[PDB]
RNA sequence: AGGACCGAACCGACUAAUGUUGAAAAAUUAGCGGAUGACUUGUGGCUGGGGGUGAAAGGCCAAUCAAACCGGGAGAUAGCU
RNA sequence: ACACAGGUGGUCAGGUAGAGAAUACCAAGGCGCUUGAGAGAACUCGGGUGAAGGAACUAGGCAAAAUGGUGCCGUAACUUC
RNA sequence: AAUUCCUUGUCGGGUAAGUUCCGACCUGCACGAAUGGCGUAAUGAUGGCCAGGCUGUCUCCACCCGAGACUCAGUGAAAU
RNA sequence: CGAUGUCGGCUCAUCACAUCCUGGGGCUGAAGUAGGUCCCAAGGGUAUGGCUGUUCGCCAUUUAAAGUGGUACGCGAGCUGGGUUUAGAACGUCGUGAGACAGUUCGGUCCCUAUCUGCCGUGGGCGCUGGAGAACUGAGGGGGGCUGCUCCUAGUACGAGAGGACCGGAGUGGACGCAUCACUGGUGUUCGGGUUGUCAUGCCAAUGGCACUGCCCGGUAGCUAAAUGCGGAAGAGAUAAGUGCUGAAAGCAUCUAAGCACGAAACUUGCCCCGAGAUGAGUUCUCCCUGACCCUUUAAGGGUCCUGAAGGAACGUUGAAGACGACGACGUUGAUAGGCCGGGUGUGUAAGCGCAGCGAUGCGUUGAGCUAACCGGUACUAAUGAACCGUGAGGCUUAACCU
């Protein structure tokens, strides 16, 4: 349940460490990006030799929200922050190489396996 | 919206429904008849009855807890001394309400609510 | 209602063991991975249980790599494989919301032992 | 806001279209004692169905 | 082909062998008996209409009795009509059971919708509410600006106002058809469907593919 | 020690909502400034209308004030309605 | 103008908690405010709580929400010290 | 610039994006020395701008407790 | 000019089409992809922000698109009051001065209880020709109508290659709408618990009152969105622009003159809702009523006596129905409401007693006690035969049967 304005930690070795959501892409008046929506972010933190830099601003799949995913079954699967992982404007595809913290299968998403196949959990 | 809620307002706020149904409860007992409004009537059988069966059983719990409810010990003391007893074999209904006509001052609906067999 | 109960009673499990908020459960959980199904372990403290009949659920939390991991099961539901006890936790609250705001440390929660 | 022009006396009229009252109809006698009641109430002298409840 | 009437017991769930929760909307489907059928030559157009459950005699009526009687099946809550289609054919005192929908695979169910009261525009109408703060006097949920000016001059019928919401025919087409249970009297849909539960609902064969 | 600080009474009146045929011809409620000083208040006194008084706004002078109120000139005058 | 939520100088100062004449609860004393009875729609007023988000509102963070005590530790620029 | 019309001047800063803000430049339409000039610690219910916290301000509204509204009884207005 | 308040915002919209997107089509300096231009088309859809009072604009980032206009430059008895904005004040500039600016700057009261029209809801009356209960037919009216992306066909047609389709099919989304409460949650001042200060119930223990529900932690039913289900259609008809067949007028040509085939989100249908006050008051099924008298201007006349059905309604118990009316359930041959029993659920181990400890407090009895609107049951309590309204066989004419 990400939105404009929405701050979220990061979960790769991108070097941002906290961007904000500038906008929720995946058609009109769309509002809330959430299991794993691809939002545009500029950069507000980031650490001093990254691979991006603060101000920066590009896209990301969000990967933990405290709002959480619902499955076939009826349960949840909620997060204690938000979290996403930084991809680069013009392929999506992660600008990190490792991933941080767990992960949901929702993001079997062919383009995001490699999250999945790195990332600790879930 | 009220759907499926129970509980009547009496233009009230919670407090003091609490402390009006307590203040005459003890009355419909230490009277075994009163008269009043009839929406207050109809709630007060909610407030009483359950007085009534709970002193079906003495022991010091149920007074005590009879007298949380009630806060008066002349009608905790009816309540399982006598009215307990005497409602012993009978399975609720014990109290009944007689409509009586329009109050003067200001028209509201009346009802007399006496427990059922008051001899008193 | 009657005829619900008739519906929902013949969906219920029969053997979900007994725990309580506190309790340290492990749930194996059934799903697939990739091209397999199979049996995957989530552990942690049961802070919520949810009771009504086929509909019963319980908020497992779990502090994974960092930071917390709440997930609700749906004890009737055929992807909970198995619920088992780990460790009988000595709380009392039957929510046991306030571990939200406790970090490592002062989450521990008292064996129950008895 | 107000009226533009007076309205005349036979709205008034159309517009207490329904304000008659309604007589009751439904006075009884009790069998016991023969004073009138409406239904499902107590006589003045607390006869109800025949059986004296109350007393007062 | 004809629907059913029934009654809408509640919701729940039924468990997928592959873990999936399907909701449901349980639906009672005693047997429908025909007490009259209609044709062209005498009526117009075909049709069965049918009754369904049972009456307290003492609040039956003479005329509905007299009616009931005729086909010579019991009294019913009440009556409701079905449009045959050419080929279908019914026969007065018929009985009709829940098997009807064994398959059909989805359907449209009909009920009266809870009954909200007199909701304002924004429950109704979903409209916007104004400002809370900011200024705004005595304005928050009222419905805004109705209209234009001296063109018009005055306000469009069907203008979005307040007032009663809730308890109106609704129909909810293709739900899928989850189980069908004579010996129980159950349908099985998929969904929530119209109206409180205990109130009547008309089931029909989903027109739309 | 202090036209010192925080803060009740007391003095005030920065914001908002309510009220606007008001509970009230200026207020209520929540917040707000001063609060040993150029403080605040009781009683009585003095200044009078082209006059007073004014840490000055044309403020205030009995629900008012770029000239009070009352009575008079007076039926001012009104090429206007 | 009203049996008007306004205005009106002075004196008195009980108990518990409290720095306190604040504040909560009480004592003495005084009161429930001169239409009431029911309903538990919209909408208005006055409050409580609120998933995820957190100024994206708006002229403006207006309004809310938030901070809030005592004692130690400890506090930058700048400075008329 | 409480002063600048042209003007959202230009450049720098801050923002994802800043007709405002800050720092600069000097082309001062039309600053300037007790009609005081330029500074200035402290003070300020003073104006402008940023940020942390905070939040129903907002996405976008829900629910609940109360006074009206609504129904009965009594009284009984108003503008026009 | 004895008062037609205003820029922008907010809220709510409604038309036009000179069409922004989606749809159809002609030409293209159209290979494909993607464009250009024009024709048809108004069904629906048609951005959040930074700055500024702004509209606009510029900028950032979306989108299929971010349309242009009219509606007192729509909308202040609907809100706002930033701009405009009287009275205070200041700068600059003008003026000897009072002062002035269509320069700037700081501050700066937005009334109105709706009679009529209109509109949204909801009743009462009468009518529909004896009266009544139903179920209908469907004239008419309203709703709805949006679209991304991926996959297949296919790395195919096309292309030197980069790239990359038409037609058709399959999925899965955005925004929107409806319903629902099963799930996930919110709330839940009527359930349970903890706790501060104080007062009371003599005291202890145990309780209750007040302090925003004192402050909090949870939470049942219900309501509810963020929650989960469904929707937009396919199809059919007649068309627009357009593409054509046959074909003369005009030995040819010609889509047209006659004749014929096609052709779009527009239209009529199909889908949902209302719907016989459709006074053109329709249809079908069922139900009820089978006494006499008097008078007058003697006629569809007025009255009286007796009768009083079907049904309505009343009264009570009431409801996921509700402002009130209304609508639904039930009224003893009874589960309508309350109570009562059992169960669930919530809270989370009451009181009391005992044991340990100097004590706070622990442990045991104990998953205890309590537990609303819930589920399954139960006539204990309240739902008394009755009253009232509505009648007593139903006009004339013609026709078809019928004696
Ligand atoms: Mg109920
Ligand atoms: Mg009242
Ligand atoms: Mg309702
Ligand atoms: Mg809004
Ligand atoms: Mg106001
Ligand atoms: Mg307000
Ligand atoms: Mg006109
Ligand atoms: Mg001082
Ligand atoms: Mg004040
Ligand atoms: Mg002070
Ligand atoms: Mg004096
Ligand atoms: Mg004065
Ligand atoms: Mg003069
Ligand atoms: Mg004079
Ligand atoms: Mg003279
Ligand atoms: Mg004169
Ligand atoms: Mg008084
Ligand atoms: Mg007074
Ligand atoms: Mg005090
Ligand atoms: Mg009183
Ligand atoms: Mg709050
Ligand atoms: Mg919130
Ligand atoms: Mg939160
Ligand atoms: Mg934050
Ligand atoms: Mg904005
Ligand atoms: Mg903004
Ligand atoms: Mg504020
Ligand atoms: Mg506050
Ligand atoms: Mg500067
Ligand atoms: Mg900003
Ligand atoms: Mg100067
Ligand atoms: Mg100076
Ligand atoms: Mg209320
Ligand atoms: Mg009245
Ligand atoms: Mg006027
Ligand atoms: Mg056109
Ligand atoms: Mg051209
Ligand atoms: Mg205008
Ligand atoms: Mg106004
Ligand atoms: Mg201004
Ligand atoms: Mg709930
Ligand atoms: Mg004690
Ligand atoms: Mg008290
Ligand atoms: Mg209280
Ligand atoms: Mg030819
Ligand atoms: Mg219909
Ligand atoms: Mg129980
Ligand atoms: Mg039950
Ligand atoms: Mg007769």
New binding site residues.
């Given amino acids: ?8 930690n990061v979960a790769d070795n991108s070097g941002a460490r906290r961007v ?13 990006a ?1 299991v794993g929506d691809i939002i ?1 972010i ?3 933190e980031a650490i001093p030799r990254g691979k991006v830099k ?4 590009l ?1 990301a799949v969000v990967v933990r ?4 995913v ?1 499955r076939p ?4 699967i ?1 997060f204690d ?2 979290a996403c992982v930084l991809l680069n ?1 013009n392929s999506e595809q992660p600008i990190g190489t490792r991933i941080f913290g767990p992960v949901t299968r929702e993001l079997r998403s062919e383009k995001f396996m490699k999250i999945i196949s790195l990332a600790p959990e879930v | ?19 009006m149904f ?1 203040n005459m409860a003890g009355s419909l007992v230490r009277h075994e008849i009163i008269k ?5 009537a ?1 709630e007060l ?2 407030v009483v ?2 007085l ?3 002193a ?1 059983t003495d ?4 007074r ?2 009879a ?3 009630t ?1 008066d ?1 002349e009608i905790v003391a009816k309540l399982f001394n006598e009215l307990g007893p005497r ?1 012993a074999s ?10 009586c006509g329009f ?1 003067a ?5 009346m009802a007399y609510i006496e427990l ?1 067999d008051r001899s008193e | ?2 005829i ?2 008739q519906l929902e009673q013949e969906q219920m499990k029969q053997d979900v063991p007994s725990f ?2 506190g309790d340290t459960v492990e749930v194996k959980v059934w799903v697939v991975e990739g091209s397999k199904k199979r049996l995957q372990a989530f552990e942690g403290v049961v802070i ?10 319980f ?1 497992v939390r779990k502090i994974s790599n960092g930071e917390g991991v ?1 997930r ?1 099961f ?1 004890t009737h539901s055929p992807v909970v494989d198995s619920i088992s006890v780990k460790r009988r936790g ?6 046991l ?2 571990l939200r705001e406790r970090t490592g440390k002062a989450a521990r929660i008292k064996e129950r032992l ?1 | ?7 005349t006396r036979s ?1 008034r009229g159309m ?1 207490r ?2 304000d008659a ?2 007589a ?5 006698v009790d ?1 016991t004692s023969g004073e009138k ?5 107590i006589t003045a002298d607390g006869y ?3 059986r004296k409840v109350i007393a007062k | 082909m004809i629907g059913l009437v029934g009654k ?1 017991v ?4 039924i468990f997928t062998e592959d873990g999936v ?5 349980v639906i009672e489907v005693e047997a429908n008996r025909v ?2 059928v ?1 044709d062209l030559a ?4 075909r ?1 069965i ?1 049918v009754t369904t459950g049972a ?17 010579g099946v019991e009294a019913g ?7 045959l289609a050419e080929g279908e054919e019914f026969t007065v005192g018929q009985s009709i059971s829940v098997e009807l929908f064994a398959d059909v695979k ?1 359907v ?1 169910v ?67 058809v989850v189980r069908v249970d004579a010996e129980r009297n159950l349908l099985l ?11 009547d609902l008309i089931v ?1 064969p989903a ?3």
Wanted: aromatic share 6%.
């Fill in positions: 349940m990400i939105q404009e304005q929405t701050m979220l904000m959501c500038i906008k929720v892409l995946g058609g009109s008046h769309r509002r809330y959430g545009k500029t950069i507000k603060k101000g920066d601003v896209k929200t405290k709002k959480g619902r079954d009826g349960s949840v909620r922050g938000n404007n | 919206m009220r759907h499926r809620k129970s509980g009547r307002q009496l233009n009230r706020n919670s407090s003091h429904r609490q402390a307590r009043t409004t009839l929406p207050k109809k059988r909610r009855e359950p009534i069966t709970l079906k022991s010091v719990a149920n005590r807890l007298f949380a409810r806060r010990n409602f009978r399975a609720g209904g014990y109290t009944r309400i007689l409509k109050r001052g200001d028209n509201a609906p059922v | 209602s009657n619900i109960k309580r908020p919520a249980i949810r009771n009504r009949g086929l509909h019963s659920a908020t709440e609700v749906q000595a709380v009392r609250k039957a929510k919301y306030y008895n | 806001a107000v009226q533009q022009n007076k309205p709205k517009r279209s329904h009252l309604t009751v109809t439904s006075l009884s069998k009641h409406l239904r499902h109430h109800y169905r025949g | 809408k509640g919701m729940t769930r929760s399907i909701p449901v909307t007490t009259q209609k005498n009526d117009g157009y049709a209409q009456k307290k005699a003492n609040r039956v009526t003479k005329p509905e009795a007299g009616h009931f009687a005729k086909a809550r009440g009556l409701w009509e079905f449009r989805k449209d009909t009920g009266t919708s809870k009954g909200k009261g007199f909701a304002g525009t924004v429950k109704r109408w979903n409209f916007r509410t104004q400002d809370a703060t900011h200024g705004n006097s005595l304005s928050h949920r009222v419905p805004g600006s109705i209209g234009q000016n001296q063109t018009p001059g005055k306000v469009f019928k069907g203008k979005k106002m307040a007032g009663q919401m809730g308890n109106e025919r609704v129909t909810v087409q293709s739900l899928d849909v998929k969904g929530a469907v119209p109206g409180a539960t205990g109130s029909k027109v739309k593919a």
